[PDB]
Paper text:
Tyrosinases, bifunctional metalloenzymes, catalyze the oxidation of monophenols and o-diphenols to o-quinones, the precursor compounds of the brown-coloured pigment melanin. Eukaryotic tyrosinases are expressed as inactive zymogens (∼50–80 kDa; latent L-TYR) before being proteolytically activated by the removal of a C-terminal active-site-shielding domain (∼20 kDa). Evidently, the function of the C-terminal domain is not restricted to a shutter function but it may also act as molecular machinery to incorporate copper ions into the active site. Isoform abPPO4 was isolated and extensively purified from the natural source (Agaricus bisporus), which contains a total of six polyphenol oxidases (PPOs).
Here, not only the first crystal structure of the mushroom tyrosinase abPPO4 is presented in its active form (Ser2–Ser383) and in its 21 kDa heavier latent form (Ser2–Thr545), but furthermore the simultaneous presence of both forms within one single-crystal structure is shown. The protein crystallized in space group C2 as a crystallo­graphic heterodimer composed of one polypeptide chain of L-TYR (Ser2–Thr556) and one chain of A-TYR (Ser2–Ser383) as well as two half POM discs ([TeW6O24]6−). The polyoxoanion [TeW6O24]6− with the Anderson–Evans-type structure was deliberately used as a cocrystallization agent to obtain single crystals suitable for X-ray diffraction. The crystal structure of mushroom tyrosinase abPPO4 was solved by combining molecular replacement (MR) and single-wavelength anomalous dispersion (SAD), benefiting from the anomalous scattering signal of the tungsten provided by the cocrystallized POM. The crystal structure of abPPO4 described here with a crystallographic heterodimeric constitution allows a direct comparison between the two active sites of a latent (zymogen) tyrosinase (L-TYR) and its proteolytically activated form (A-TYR). Hence, the CuA site seems to be fixed irrespective of whether or not the C-terminal domain is present. Thus, a coordination of the CuB ion that includes this seventh His282 may be assumed to be an alternative conformation with a minor probability (CuB2; occupancy 0.09). The residue Phe454 acts as the substrate placeholder, pointing directly towards CuB at a distance of 4.3 Å (C∊2–CuB). Therefore, an active-site blocking function of the C-terminal domain in a comparable manner can be supported by the data presented here. Thus, each polyoxoanion is bound by a total of eight amino acids from two equivalent monomers (A-TYR abPPO4 or L-TYR abPPO4).
Residue numbers in the entry: 2 to 383
């Protein structure tokens, strides 16, 4: 790899709930600045928003690969779907994003004229916030509605700049979008589009509000009831025995956001990553994995075939815990694997759900987290 996925820096910090995250002046300002920074980078820059999101689906090109690397076994996206590697591949996927996103936030923290240390420390603690869809499906206005958002300027004064969280603006629309009727002319990413291809946020807020109750119940059953890895990892082939998987419950959020009258970006695996809200989603999807690990310790990746097909594995290939997770590398010559990814500390992150039980026995944690899930996703509306 040209850019190994080593994760963020500054020790093990928590990925905050977006509801709390937006209330944090330093974190929110750094996120809005850094996110705009990587969105404005050249799309041929590997550490740019485009190439980072491009890893998931289109374009079908290698990411941060050496000059004389062997041809990829399959021309398609990188993301692993309908297979046993879904949870682990996406865990390290958010890691490279969070890593690159912090790196931009460091340069941002140097532009501040006052409190240079505190801005430097905030960047060090900066992590990808998660969207708790199971407890609060309707996100904050900063994420879904506010065209302009309040941040702190480099002099300390409060200003309002355009919100980079709502949508990404292609520059240009990559030549690999040509064949697809609606996404080739769409200048920016779109959520819940109408028949006239116009974005419809109001209808989206309405959709989420109604799907809220069912989403909490789906999330509850997913977290608590999954002994074997096969039924928990993937959904394929959208059957009943996988309906309670981490991915199946994960699919509903892509549909809610992307699927309107016509299909938007979030409801298409080849374009879903380009929507900025994609990362808040899969940060929470990763939190589910962390919570599930607390309930089902010892259970991890089991063997399974590549059914859909990705640029890492051709259809029919056998996959296990020792399978390489392209294009994510521990070092220059060592690809990531599922085995070590049980410990998020290796990527310098964690979730606030575990704060009151740090350094506790697996038994105490399993009881604390279980009560946590029951109390949060096992009760009535919020
Ligand atoms: Cu994916
Ligand atoms: Cu997804
Ligand atoms: Na790609």
């Amino acid at each position: 790899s040209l850019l190994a996925t080593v994760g963020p820096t500054g020790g093990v910090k928590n990925r905050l709930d977006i509801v709390d995250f937006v209330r944090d002046e330093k974190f929110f300002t750094l996120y809005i600045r850094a996110l705009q920074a990587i969105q404005d980078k050249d799309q041929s820059d590997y550490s740019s928003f485009f190439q980072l999101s491009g890893i998931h689906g289109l374009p079908f090109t290698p990411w941060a690969k050496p000059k004389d690397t062997p041809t990829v076994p399959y021309e398609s996206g990188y993301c692993t779907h309908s297979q046993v590697l879904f949870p682990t591949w996406h865990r390290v996927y958010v890691s490279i994003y969070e890593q690159i996103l912090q790196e931009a936030a460091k340069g941002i923290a140097k532009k501040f004229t006052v409190h240079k240390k505190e801005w430097a420390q905030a960047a060090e603690d900066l992590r990808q916030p998660y969207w708790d869809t199971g407890f609060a499906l309707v996100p904050p206005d900063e994420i879904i509605k506010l065209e302009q958002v309040k941040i702190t300027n480099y002099d300390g004064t409060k200003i309002t700049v355009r919100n980079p969280i709502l949508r990404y603006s292609f520059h240009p629309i990559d030549p690999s979008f040509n064949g697809y009727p609606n996404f080739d002319t769409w200048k920016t990413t779109v959520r819940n589009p109408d028949a006239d291809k116009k974005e419809n946020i109001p209808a989206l807020i309405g959709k989420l509000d109604l799907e809220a109750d069912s989403t909490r119940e789906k999330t509850y059953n997913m977290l608590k009831f999954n002994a074997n890895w096969e039924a928990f990892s993937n959904h394929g082939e959208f059957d009943d025995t996988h309906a309670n998987s981490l991915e199946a419950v994960h699919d509903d959020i892509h549909g809610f956001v992307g699927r309107g009258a016509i299909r938007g970006h979030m409801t298409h695996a080849l374009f879903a990553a380009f929507d900025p809200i994609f990362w808040l989603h899969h940060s929470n999807v990763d939190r589910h994995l962390s919570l599930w690990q607390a309930l089902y310790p010892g259970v991890w990746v089991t063997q399974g075939p590549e059914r859909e097909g990705s640029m890492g594995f051709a259809p029919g290939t056998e996959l296990n815990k020792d399978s390489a997770l392209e294009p994510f590398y521990e070092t220059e010559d060592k690809p990531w694997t599922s085995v070590p990814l049980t410990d998020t500390a290796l990527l310098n992150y964690s979730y606030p759900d575990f704060d009151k039980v740090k350094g506790g026995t697996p038994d105490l944690v399993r009881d604390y987290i279980n009560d946590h899930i029951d109390r949060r996703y096992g009760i009535k509306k919020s």
